[PDB]
Write a protein that binds this ligand. Structure first.
Ligand code: BG6
Ligand code: MG
Ligand code: NA
Length: 219
């Protein structure tokens, strides 16, 4: 049986992937880049703030100064941080609170493997911090998603091997990171976005301890 679950935050715990998308699209349009639509945004999910901005600039083969790059990233963050102030426990996705409770009752470790530096603040907004045994700090990894480092760190932070862990993700980059960590991925979203080669559930209500067991027994 698995000994840890490694949670992505945005698009897994709550609908903040939507807010990252809206904030990045707004930023892109301010600088005359109009290609950040929902399809393109699948390439941005799970990706760090700086890598996200660079992918957007690349889309237009646009170059900005180092000073402008810093300011643009800060502008997007300031906007996103204002968007999330009213997040509350009511915004926790279906099934997630119960899963956290059931994992703890079964002595299964819980770790956060979010790329977001705003992750701790969001867990506090949602009254979830006390469920987490560890938060892997994305500022401390040498390499960001789709590199596996954040998932490896999360597992190690709770004293469990990645190979004894499940990772929950909504993103292409994050699914790849889980795969390369050695943990077992279960995605949430559309196979057209996340692939047909791992277990994918259509919504977070499917993330029951019963189902994670159903999946683990068959890997
Ligand atoms: O700018 P932050 O809060 O550090 O977030 C970094 C990344 O966090 C990830 O969780 C999101 O999927 C990305 O969309 C986001 O860019
Ligand atoms: Mg995500
Ligand atoms: Na406009």
């Amino acid at each position: 049986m698995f000994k840890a679950v490694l949670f992505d935050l945005d698009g897994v715990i709550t609908d903040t992937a939507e807010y990252h998308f809206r904030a990045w699209k707004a930023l892109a349009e301010e600088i005359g880049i109009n290609g950040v639509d929902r399809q393109f945004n699948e390439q941005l999910k799970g990706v760090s703030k700086e890598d996200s901005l660079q992918k957007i600039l690349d889309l237009a083969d646009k170059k900005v100064s180092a000073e402008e790059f810093k300011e643009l990233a800060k502008r997007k963050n300031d906007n996103y941080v204002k968007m999330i102030q009213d997040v509350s426990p009511a915004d926790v996705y279906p099934g997630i609170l119960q899963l956290l409770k059931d994992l703890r009752s079964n002595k299964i470790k819980i770790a956060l493997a979010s790329a977001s530096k705003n992750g701790p603040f969001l867990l506090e907004r949602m009254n979830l911090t006390g469920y987490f045994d560890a938060i892997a700090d994305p500022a401390e990894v040498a390499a960001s998603k789709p590199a596996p480092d954040i998932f490896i760190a999360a597992a190690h932070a709770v004293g469990v091997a990645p190979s004894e862990s499940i990772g929950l993700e909504d993103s292409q980059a994050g699914i790849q990171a889980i795969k390369d960590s050695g943990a077992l991925p279960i995605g949430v979203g559309r196979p057209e976005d996340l692939g047909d080669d791992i277990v994918i559930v259509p919504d977070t209500s499917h993330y029951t301890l019963e189902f994670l067991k159903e999946v683990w027994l068959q890997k």
